[PDB]
RNA sequence: GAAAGUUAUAAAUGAAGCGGUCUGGAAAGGCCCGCCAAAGACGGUAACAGCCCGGUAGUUGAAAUGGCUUUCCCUCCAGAGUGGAUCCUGAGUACGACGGAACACGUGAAAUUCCGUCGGAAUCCGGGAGGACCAUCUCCCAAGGCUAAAUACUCCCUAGUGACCGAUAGUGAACCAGUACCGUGAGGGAAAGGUGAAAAGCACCCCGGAAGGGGAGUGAAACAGUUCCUGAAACCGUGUGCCUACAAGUAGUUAGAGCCCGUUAAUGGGUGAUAGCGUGCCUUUUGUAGAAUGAACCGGCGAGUUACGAUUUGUUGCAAGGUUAAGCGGAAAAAGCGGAGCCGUAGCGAAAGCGAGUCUGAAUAGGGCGCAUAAGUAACAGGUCGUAGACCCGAAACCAGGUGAUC
RNA sequence: AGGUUCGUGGUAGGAGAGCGUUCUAAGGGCGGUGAAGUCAGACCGGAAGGACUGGUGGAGCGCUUAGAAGUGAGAAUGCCG
C-alpha cells in the first residue's frame, strides 16, 4: 500500500485551461477572439447552417411502420455441427446449450456454413438451401 | 477539500522585488512596477551580450590604427600584408602588443612592409 | 505447508488447492480493485452555496451608468466579499465497482502472494475458553508474529474475536468477509484449517 | 438525460450494414412537366450521404 | 377495565505505575523497567497519558409518568345445498349534438376520461369494452361507499459519521444578530474570535493636573501589561558607508576608474565620475511609445465544474460471446444470490417477405446496399459534443403578489 | 547505451513532459537540546522552483509511493480592508 503503480498508460492527468500563458490554454483558453463560440454558453445547434435550410429538411421522408412484424432468431449450419449425430435439434436444446437466449418470434435456419452429420431439426422456419442442406447430410426436417 | 492561497504568492513576489535592488524609487519596493523593471533588465543584457563583442572590436581597431600611423602605413594597408604574410595574430592581441610592446608590434610592422 | 498448533507446536502438513493459492498473481488488476474498494468507502458530504443559495441578494446595488463605478448586478455575485461560490464541491458518490471475474481473480492473486512471501501460517485450531486478552497475546507472543495480523476463522472457535479486540495491529474476521483491501492492510495471515476449507470451497 | 433523437430525420435517414447513412433524392413531388425522363429515371434511386454532412449530423440520429 | 413483561425519561459499580532517571517553568516527551485489558472510545490535566481525573468494556438500578407487546376481561356474531313461475340488481343516469379541457396524442381516420348547455336509452330474450365503425368472438357488469403495507418530506429530540469550512471561509449571524444602521412603509441589512498554566493584572519610588513614561516587582516570557499568540507589505521616521549644485534623464543595461567592505569562498559584496546603446505593462488592432483602453499603492478574495447520455483514444478481464439492473444479504462492508433486460453473432426491402443474399425490373441482364474479406463486450482514465445558468461579471426591459396621497 | 545526418524565431492553435499548493492511505521520520509561520544572506537546478545557516516565534510538521481537488492572479471604470 505505499508502493502502489497503476498499469502504465491507463491514467492520464487532466488538463485546466486559463493558468497562465506558459501552458498554451491562458488568456483564451483555447477559444480564439470574439465569436458567438467565444461566449458562455454559446454556439449552435446540433445540425445548423447559419439560415441555410438543413440537410434533413431538403429530402423526403419514406415509409411506414407495420405493427404485426416478425423477427426471428436466427441459426445457421456452422454451430449446428456442434452436436452428436443421430439426435433431435430442438428449440429447447438451443435455449439450453447457448446457442440462442432470445427467441424472438421463432427459430429459422439459415444455410451459411457446412454440416457432416445426419440430425433431425424440428424449428419454425427454414431456408430452402437449408433444407437441402440438411437432406443431404440424411438428416430431417420438421416445420413446429 | 479547500485550498486557501498563503505563502506561495509572497515567495514568488518577494523574489522579484528583491532582484530590483538598487533601482529608484518604487521601482526597488512595489512589486508591479519592479517586474517590468526585471525584465526590461534582462532583454537589455541579452542584447548587450551582443554588442559587447563588436565594441570590443572598434576599440582594438582603432588602437591599432594610432600604433601603425606611426610607422607610416594605415590600419588597412598592415592588415593586408599581415595576410599576405601568414600571420595570424587577431586584432585583440596586436592592440594589447601595441599598447604594452610596442618593440614587437614594429617587427610585425615591418614584416608585414616587407610582405606588401 | 506445515500445519501447527495453537501453542506453536508443529502439528503435521497440510495441502492448500493450487487453483487458489498457487496461480501468478495479477498485480495490476489488485492494484484496480485497490482504488476501486478505496473509493467505494468515502461518504462524500459536502456542499457550497452559489450565487442563488446565498442569503440576500437580488436588488441591484445601484444603476447601469452614470455615477462613476463598475457595473453590478447583485451584491451576493462571485466577486464580492460574502457572495456566492462558482462552482466548489457538491453532494456526489465516489463508489465503482468492476466486473465480477476481475474481482476474483484479484483475491486470488493477493492470497496467493501473501503465500510466496511465507506470510501465511496455516492454525489447527483457535479456542479460548473465556475471553482473556493476556492468554491471546501470549498466543500471539508463541508463533512469531509481532506484526499486523489477520486472523480467519470458523465456527466453533469461541471467544477470539473478544480476546484479540483491544489488541491494536490484530483483525479477526469470520471467514466469509475476506477481501482484498483487509488483506493488503495487514501483514501477515493467519488462518485456521476450517476456514480455508471453507475459503478454499468459495473460490 | 439521456440524449433525445432527433425525430425528423429519423423518419427520412437509414443506416447500412457498414454504419453509414442512406437517404432518398429531393426533387421528385410536383413539376415533371419541367425534367427530362433521364433525369427522373435518375432521381427515384436512393443515395448516400456525403462526409461533410455525417461529420455535422452524426450525433443527432446516434441511435 | 385489569395483570405480566419490555422500553424511555435521574443514576450505581467498575482493572492496572505517586516506577527510576534526563531536559525543562511545568513531563503525558527521551532512555531503562513493570502491569491491566470483554476496558488502547473521547475529553481534561503546566508539553504528546490504557495504568492522574471524568470516564470506557462488562454488570446493575426506578418511587413516578409515558409508550409498546401478550393474557384476561369486555363486546358482537347464522352458513351450507337443491330449484328456476314471478320479482330485484344504482335515470334526467349512460349516451348524442354544440363549445372547451385532460389523455405522450396540437381535431386528426380519434377510441378513452371530465366540465357547461340542450336533447335523451335499455333493463338478463339486458348492458359495456377490445383506439372511427359494422359482424363474429373474447373479456367484463357503470351511473353508491370504506380500506393497512410497500411511497414523499424534516421545524424538531436522541446517538453518531465525513480524503466538509476554519473567522474576507463556514449560516446573514462562532462575539447580547435579524441586532446597529437606512427607509413613511412593505422592505434592505453590517462590522466585530485568541493575555497568561495560573491574575500571580505591576506594592513601593521618581517626572507629570492627568494621560504617558523610567525604575522596582510577578512570570518561563512584560519586545505576554486588560484590540494582550504570531506580526508580512504599502506607508511614516532616526542614524549612517558611497555619489550628487554646467546638467536635457521610460531611469536600466554594457564598458569603467575612484572610494568603502569582507561571503553559503568565488574568475566575491556596496556605491558609482565618465562613455556606448535604449520610446512602461495590458487589451484591442492592417498598424499602438501611443495624444486609443485599464490600473493611486499594498494585501486578501475573484473565472471550463458536476450529474446523466453520445463518440473516439488508451488500459485491464473474458471472448462468439460479454455483462447484470432493481432487489435479497450484510457493518453507510466484502462475497454469494438475482439472466428480467442490453449490446454482439446477418443482411436486404416502404412492406408482405426472402436470406449469404436481397431490392428494382418481364429479365438466368445490369446496377444499389451487404457476404466472401468474422470480434465483440464490461469497467476505469484522457479529449470533444448534448441536456442542465454550463468559463466569469454586466443591461435596458417583461410578468406575479404586496406597500405607499405625512411630498 | 553509443553513433551519423538533418534541425531548434514565432501570434491564434494542436501535441508532450513537468513544478508547486490543500487533503487521504500505507511506509519511514523530525520536533521544547525548539514545529509551522516570519526576517536576512555572496548556495543549488534548464524553467516552474529547492536547500543550508542565523534572528524572531512558542507547538506541531516534513519525506516516499499512490489517490482526490474550492489548484497557481497584475489588469475585470472587479469586492473588502
Ligand atoms: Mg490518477
Ligand atoms: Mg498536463
Ligand atoms: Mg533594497
Ligand atoms: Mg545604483
Ligand atoms: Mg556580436
Ligand atoms: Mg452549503
Ligand atoms: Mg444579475
Ligand atoms: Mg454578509
Ligand atoms: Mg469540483
Ligand atoms: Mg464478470
Ligand atoms: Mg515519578
Ligand atoms: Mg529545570
Ligand atoms: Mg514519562
Ligand atoms: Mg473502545
Ligand atoms: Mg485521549
Ligand atoms: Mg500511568
Ligand atoms: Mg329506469
Ligand atoms: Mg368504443
Ligand atoms: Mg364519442
Ligand atoms: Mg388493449
Ligand atoms: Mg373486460
Ligand atoms: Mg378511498
Ligand atoms: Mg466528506
Ligand atoms: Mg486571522
Ligand atoms: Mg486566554
Ligand atoms: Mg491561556
Ligand atoms: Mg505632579
Ligand atoms: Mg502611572
Ligand atoms: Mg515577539
Ligand atoms: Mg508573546
Ligand atoms: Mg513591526
Ligand atoms: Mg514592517
Ligand atoms: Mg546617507
Ligand atoms: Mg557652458
Ligand atoms: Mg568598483
Ligand atoms: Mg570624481
Ligand atoms: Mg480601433
Ligand atoms: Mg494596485
Ligand atoms: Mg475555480
Ligand atoms: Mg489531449
Ligand atoms: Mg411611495
Ligand atoms: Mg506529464
Ligand atoms: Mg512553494
Ligand atoms: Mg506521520
Ligand atoms: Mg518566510
Ligand atoms: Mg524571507
Ligand atoms: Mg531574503
Ligand atoms: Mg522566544
Ligand atoms: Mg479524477
Ligand atoms: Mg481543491
Ligand atoms: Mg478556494
Ligand atoms: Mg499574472
Ligand atoms: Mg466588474
Ligand atoms: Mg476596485
Ligand atoms: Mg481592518
Ligand atoms: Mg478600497
Known amino acids: ?36 463560440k467565444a461566449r458562455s454558453g454559446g454556439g449552435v445547434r446540433l445540425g445548423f447552417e447559419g439560415g441555410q435550410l438543413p440537410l434533413f429538411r431538403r429530402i423526403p421522408k419514406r415509409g411506414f411502420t407495420n ?17 452428436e449425430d443421430g439426435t433431435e435439434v430442438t428449440p429447447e436444446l438451443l435455449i439450453e446449450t447457448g446457442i440462442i437466449r432470445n427467441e424472438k ?13 445426419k440430425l433431425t431439426v424440428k424449428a419454425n422456419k427454414f431456408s430452402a438451401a437449408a433444407k437441402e442442406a440438411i437432406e443431404a447430410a440424411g438428416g430431417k426436417t420438421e416445420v413446429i | 477539500p479547500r485550498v486557501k492561497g498563503g505563502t506561495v504568492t509572497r515567495k514568488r513576489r518577494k523574489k522579484i522585488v528583491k532582484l530590483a535592488k538598487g533601482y529608484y524609487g518604487s521601482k526597488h519596493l512595489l512589486f508591479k512596477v519592479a517586474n517590468q523593471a526585471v525584465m526590461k533588465s534582462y532583454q537589455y543584457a541579452y542584447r548587450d551580450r551582443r554588442q559587447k563583442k563588436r565594441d570590443f572590436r572598434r576599440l582594438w581597431i582603432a588602437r591599432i590604427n594610432a600604433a601603425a600611423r606611426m610607422q ?39 614584416s608585414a612592409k616587407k610582405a606588401l | 505447508l506445515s500445519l501447527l498448533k495453537q501453542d506453536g507446536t508443529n502439528a503435521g502438513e497440510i495441502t492448500l488447492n493450487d487453483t487458489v493459492f498457487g496461480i501468478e498473481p495479477n498485480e495490476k488488476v489488485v492494484v484496480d480493485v485497490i482504488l476501486s474498494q478505496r473509493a467505494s468507502l468515502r461518504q462524500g458530504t459536502h456542499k457550497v452555496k452559489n450565487r442563488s443559495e446565498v442569503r440576500g441578494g437580488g436588488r441591484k446595488p445601484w444603476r447601469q451608468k452614470g455615477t462613476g463605478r ?28 468492476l466486473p465480477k471475474k476481475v474481482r476474483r481473480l484479484a483475491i486470488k492473486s493477493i492470497l496467493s502472494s501473501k503465500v510466496n512471501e511465507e506470510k501465511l501460517v496455516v492454525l489447527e485450531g483457535l479456542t479460548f475458553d473465556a475471553p482473556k486478552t493476556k492468554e491471546f497475546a501470549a498466543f500471539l507472543k508463541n508463533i512469531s508474529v509481532d506484526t499486523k495480523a489477520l486472523i480467519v476463522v470458523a465456527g466453533e472457535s469461541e471467544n477470539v474475536e473478544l480476546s ?12 466469509e468477509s475476506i477481501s482484498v483491501l483487509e488483506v493488503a492492510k495487514h501483514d501477515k495471515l493467519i488462518i485456521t484449517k476450517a476456514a480455508v476449507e471453507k475459503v478454499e470451497e468459495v473460490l | 438525460p439521456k440524449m433525445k433523437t ?39 434511386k436512393s443515395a448516400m450521404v456525403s462526409a461533410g454532412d455525417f461529420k455535422r449530423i452524426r450525433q443527432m440520429v446516434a441511435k
Not at chain 2, 599576405?84 to 599598447?99: E, H, P, Q, S, T
Not at chain 4, 429519423?10 to 450494414?17: D, E, I, L, S, Y
Open chain 1, 1 to 36: 500500500l505505499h508502493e502502489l503503480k497503476p498499469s502504465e498508460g491507463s491514467r492520464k492527468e487532466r488538463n485546466r485551461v486559463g493558468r497562465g500563458t506558459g501552458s498554451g490554454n491562458g488568456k483564451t483558453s483555447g477559444r480564439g477572439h470574439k465569436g458567438q
Open chain 1, 67 to 83: 405493427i404485426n412484424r416478425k423477427e426471428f432468431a436466427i441459426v445457421n449450419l456452422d454451430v449446428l455441427n456442434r452436436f
Open chain 1, 105 to 117: 418470434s421463432g427459430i429459422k435456419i439459415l444455410s451459411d456454413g457446412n454440416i457432416e452429420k
Open chain 2, 72 to 110: 607610416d602605413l594605415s590600419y588597412s594597408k598592415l592588415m593586408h600584408g599581415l595576410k599576405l604574410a601568414g600571420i595570424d595574430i587577431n586584432r585583440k592581441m596586436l592592440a594589447d602588443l601595441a599598447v604594452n610592446d610596442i618593440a614587437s608590434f614594429n617587427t610585425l610592422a615591418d
Open chain 3, 70 to 97: 463598475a457595473r453590478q448586478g447583485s451584491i451576493r455575485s462571485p466577486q464580492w466579499r460574502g457572495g456566492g461560490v462558482v462552482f466548489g464541491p457538491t453532494p456526489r458518490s465516489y463508489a465503482y465497482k
Open chain 3, 164 to 175: 484479540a479486540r483491544n489488541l491494536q495491529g490484530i483483525t479477526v474476521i469470520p471467514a
Open chain 4, 6 to 44: 432527433h425525430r425528423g430525420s429519423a423518419k427520412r435517414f437509414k443506416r447500412t450494414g457498414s454504419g453509414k447513412l442512406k437517404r432518398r433524392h429531393g426533387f421528385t413531388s410536383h413539376m415533371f412537366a419541367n425534367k427530362s425522363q433521364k433525369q427522373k429515371r435518375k432521381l427515384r
